[PDB]
Symmetry: D3
Subunit: 30 residues, 6 copies
């Protein structure tokens, strides 16, 4: 169903934001 499809896409965005946060922590530890 399409709501389950959107839910999976949000789960994918959440994973990408976590990846950005990890990168910023590296910029700060710069």
């Amino acid at each position: 169903g399409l709501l389950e499809e959107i839910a999976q896409l949000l789960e994918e965005i959440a994973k990408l934001l976590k990846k950005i946060a990890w990168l910023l922590k590296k910029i700060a530890q710069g």
Copy 2:
């Protein structure tokens, strides 16, 4: 530091998005 604080805020946003996904599956069921 300020950049580390921003990163922690992004992690909080991700947790909120996962909660939205859980709610959407409940709506569908």
Copy 3:
């Protein structure tokens, strides 16, 4: 209800984004 919970989570996300913006200005200034 489930949709209202989703809206509340979006409002929380917006507050977190405003905090990130303030921190960016402190980095700049």
Copy 4:
């Protein structure tokens, strides 16, 4: 500067999310 421009764009995204929340509350009310 450019960081201040990004800050402004994040403030705009926050405003737009707040609008989506407003709209979802309206769907739920019906």
Copy 5:
């Protein structure tokens, strides 16, 4: 670099948000 990597992930987030937007439009189509 790390900023360019963040930029790429932000672009992917934007693409997924557009897919969500399209699925929302399809939900409106039944």
Copy 6:
């Protein structure tokens, strides 16, 4: 409809995220 408005707001957020991605590339350049 309201879902369609939400979809368009998500598209606008996606555009702002793309602009942030551009500015981050410019900061890196720079």
